[PDB]
Amino acid sequence: LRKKSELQGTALGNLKQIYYYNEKAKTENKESHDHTILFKGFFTDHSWYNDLLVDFDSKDIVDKYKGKKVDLYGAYYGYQCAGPNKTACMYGGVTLHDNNRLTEEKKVPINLWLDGKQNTVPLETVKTNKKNVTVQELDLQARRYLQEKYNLYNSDVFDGKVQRGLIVFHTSTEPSVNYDLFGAQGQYSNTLLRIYRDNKTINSENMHIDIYLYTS
């Protein structure tokens, strides 16, 4: 399952920057024309970056989002970017504008288990403003709520009791998305955020999230 013991350097700190100290890239009315798609002049007030790069697993499905108004939701990075010196990279988190709008904001309920014992989690934390939303948009918001309550990506010294963890997104239409919190490969953002390369977009109609936390 998940092993916190395999420190692999500054991986703990970098994972905390991805989910807790994140400046999540949020955009609704944005179109591109440049397997990677470049967004010219994406960053309005940023001294480091001006443009945004979106990488995908397969180039065959990359043309589906390429030409149309697409909604952006995900975490961007600067270190080890394949472009000059003013561009930020990102993996997936792309959804179409057509039929992906709802009247009243969806309130997805979250369930958590701490070594067997069930803990009440408020539904106001995780929210999606689209009909078919990406796994990245739900994962970033769920891990942020966890980190604030029980220090997830903090060292044993800085009160981090969680050693093993698993996050699941219920079988509402088709099989569930299973991911281990400490099982992300690599130590830098370019490898840790590589899980969203497939660009998995699932239905947000009456779905729920189940998180399994273990102290040992």
Epitope: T10, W48, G78, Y79, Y188, S189
Partner: T-cell receptor, first 109, second 113 residues
């Protein structure tokens, strides 16, 4: 992780308006070299950046050679304001700079 | 001006207390560096950042140390429990190229009984 730097001389006693040459030696091959000045208030002032060749700016001169693995710092007509500790920032990791022991300089008027 | 600001500039704390230091570098600068300097000695490397992620942490660095880079360019260095020998000048620097390192005034920490 492993980079050894020894600055010669460790202590320098010089008269007002006199010339002096302090050197910085390093073990492994180096891509980036830096020379700093520390004032009694505790602030590092970047004097020179010499990865290779020689640079001439103001009253201070600096030369560095990557072959023989050594750096040099010159002080033409040294004043009482030049008194302080001169450091040698050396880089092997990706871009990580590691400071040396430091050359203690005290200009006597 | 030095170019790189550091708040606070002087801090006094009791043995076994939590302390934090904020470093505000130049907006354009991609890199950030953390150094520790004692009385009449050279500054020892602690940890350095490149853009959004932490690149390396020193082997000699204690487990009570944690450098975090929140929303923006600034970085925060924290000490869990204050011990003897922690009383040192904590220097912060920034790099663009990263050719030249621009140093700040540095926080002077004093760990008293």
């Amino acid at each position: 992780m492993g980079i050894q730097v020894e600055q010669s001389p460790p202590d320098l006693i010089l008269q007002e308006g006199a010339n002096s040459t302090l050197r910085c030696n390093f073990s492994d091959s180096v891509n980036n070299l830096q020379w700093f000045h520390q004032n009694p208030w505790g602030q590092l002032i970047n004097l020179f950046y010499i990865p290779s060749g020689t640079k001439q700016n103001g009253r201070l001169s600096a030369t560095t050679v990557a072959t023989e693995r050594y750096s040099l710092l010159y002080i033409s007509s040294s004043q009482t304001t030049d008194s302080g500790v001169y450091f040698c920032a050396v880089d092997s990791g990706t871009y990580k700079y590691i400071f040396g022991t430091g050359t203690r300089l005290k200009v006597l008027a | 001006d030095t170019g790189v600001s550091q708040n606070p500039r002087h801090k006094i704390t009791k043995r076994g207390q939590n302390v934090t230091f904020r470093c505000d570098p130049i907006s354009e600068h991609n890199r950030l560096y953390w150094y520790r300097q004692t009385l009449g000695q050279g500054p020892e490397f602690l940890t350095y950042f490149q853009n959004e992620a932490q690149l390396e942490k020193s082997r000699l660095l204690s487990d009570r140390f944690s450098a975090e880079r929140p929303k923006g360019s600034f970085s925060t260095l924290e000490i869990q429990r204050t011990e003897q020998g922690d009383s040192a000048m904590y220097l912060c620097a920034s790099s663009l190229g990263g050719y030249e390192q621009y140093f700040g005034p540095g926080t002077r920490l004093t760990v008293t009984e």
